[PDB]
Amino acid sequence: KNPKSDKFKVKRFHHIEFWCGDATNVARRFSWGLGMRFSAKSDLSTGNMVHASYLLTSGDLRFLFTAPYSPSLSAGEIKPTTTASIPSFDHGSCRSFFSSHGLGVRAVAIEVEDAESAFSISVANGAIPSSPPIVLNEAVTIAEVKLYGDVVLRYVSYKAEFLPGFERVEDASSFPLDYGIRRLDHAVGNVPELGPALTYVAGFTGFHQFAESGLNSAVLASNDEMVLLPINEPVHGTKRKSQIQTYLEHNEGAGLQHLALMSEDIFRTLREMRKRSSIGGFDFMPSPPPTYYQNLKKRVGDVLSDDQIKECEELGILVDRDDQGTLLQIFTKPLGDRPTIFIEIIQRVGCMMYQSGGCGGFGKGNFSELFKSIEEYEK
């Protein structure tokens, strides 16, 4: 049931912005770890005296890393005369965010038909404004509203290259890494209370609900369900403490928990990333025990060959299936010092019409199948 109730025209995920203490080191680690190319920059070398911002791209995935310079470099400026390429940026907000949360996602950015109208309509419908719409070089409009915690939903719209004042980075500094990642599939928030968070966000977007865990969840989706925003809350009382509660504690409250990155070939992606785990890239969660992969034949031997099922097992991939498609997924260990944000790599198979959004779900069945796997391996 898709009521198609978006209160404004949403297109697709546009970029994710990390607020960093040092954008250079985070962007370089991510580039090597995820196989993303340095695409654009806005920093001192481009006249930005306010923040250093580095854009990595892989397919349609856009990861932006931003850190503040010393405020002294821009002490003379005012908002009308700012050299910041992202006018929403604030030194105090950025430093406060990073000291409070550590490395994390500041903005989930979605492309819309008209960012001014999206902001207007959202705020008229309960959205807490974060940064009013501003037009950049008469070409791009950007506006921000609070999403949850200190994470903003960022609207971007183009009348008609990332953002004005960003420059394309030199080919000598841009090595064409590509491990197969292609787009952002969904971005997941953790909140203390799911009900109020859902009511707030679905309230101002018109996004619709998309049809001992330690958590409860729900997924908000745009009209074509290409912008998917799951939200988790903890469940208290479990024997094992809720991973959402640990997140909230270590993050100092609500924030973005994981980014799901769609791969055009998850096996190549996971081979390429696992090769680099101990040489500056990302670690992955412990693999499921071989019991899990034996039980895979009875569940998805329809969709995957035994050769491909054993390829999952060597890479530690998880597999789930809806009533419509199959989901291949795996999770990294936390991206930085705190047990907060991590990445999920996914590939979806089925639901060809192009592929419809959410095909195969989000792996909810892998909770049950994993604990059953824990019991069979112990035996």
Contact 221, 210 (CB under 8 A): yes
Would you say how long the chain is, in residues?
379
Nearest to 331 by CA among 319, 321, 340, 318: 318
Counting contacts by CB under 8 A, is residue 278 touching a second copy?
yes
| First-to-last C-alpha distance (Å) of the chain | 42
Lay out the site mask for Co ion across 31-70 (x = CB under 5 A, - = otherwise).
----------------------------------------
Asked if 344 touches ligand A1LWQ (CB under 6 A), the answer is yes
Query: Which residues, 6 or more positions from 303, have their beta carbon under 8 angstroms from its beta carbon?
Result: 321, 326, 349, 350
Binding partner of residue 217 among ligand A1LWQ, a second copy, Co ion, none, CB cut-off 5 to 8 Å per kind: ligand A1LWQ
Least distance from C-beta 219 to ligand A1LWQ, angstroms?
6
Confirm or reject binding of residue 249 to a second copy (CB under 8 A): yes
Task: Determine the size of the site formed for a second copy (CB under 8 A).
Answer: 48
Q: Enumerate residues 189-228 that contact ligand A1LWQ by CB under 6 A.
A: 217, 219
Dist CA 102 CA 337 (whole Å): 8
Partner residues linked to 155 by β-bridges = 110, 143
Instruction: Report if residue 254 touches a second copy, rule: CB under 8 A.
Output: no
Tell whether 258 is in a known binding site: yes
Consecutive H or E run containing 205? helix 194-205
Burial label, 243 (beta-carbon count in 10 A; 0-12, 13-18, 19+): middle
CB 256 within 8 A of CB 188: yes
155 to 26, 103, 144, 252: CA distances (angstroms): 24, 22, 6, 26
**Which residues inside 242-301 make contact with Co ion, applying CB under 5 A?**
260
C-alpha gyration radius of the chain = 21
Query: How far is residue 135's CA from residue 138's CA, in Å, rounded to a whole number?
Result: 6
Q: Which of 9, 12, 29, 310: binder of a second copy (CB under 8 A)?
A: 29
144 annotated among ligand-binding-site residues:
no
Does 260 sit near ligand A1LWQ (CB under 6 A)? yes
Please provide residue 76's backbone torsions phi and psi, each rounded to the nearest 5 degrees: -80, -20
The sheet carrying 140-148 orders its strands as 129-136, 140-148, 151-158, 104-112, 10-19, 61-68, 51-58, 37-42, 167-168
Applying CB under 8 A, the span of 157-165, 195-203, 273-281, 284-292 interacting with a second copy comes to 273-281
Which residue from 9, 11, 21, 311 is in contact with a second copy, where contact means CB under 8 A?
21
344 annotated among ligand-binding-site residues: yes
Which member of 214, 362, 369, 373 binds ligand A1LWQ (CB under 6 A)?
362
Binding mask 128-167 for ligand A1LWQ (x = CB under 6 A): ----------------------------------------
- Interface residues toward a second copy, by CB under 8 A: 20-26, 28-33, 38, 43-44, 52, 67-70, 72-73, 95, 98-100, 102-103, 172-175, 177, 249-252, 278-281, 283, 335-339
- Interface residues toward Co ion, by CB under 5 A: 260, 344, 362
The annotated binding site for Fe cation is made up of 186, 258, 344
- Interface residues toward ligand A1LWQ, by CB under 6 A: 186, 188, 217, 219, 230, 260, 344, 362-364
The annotated binding site is made up of 186, 258, 344
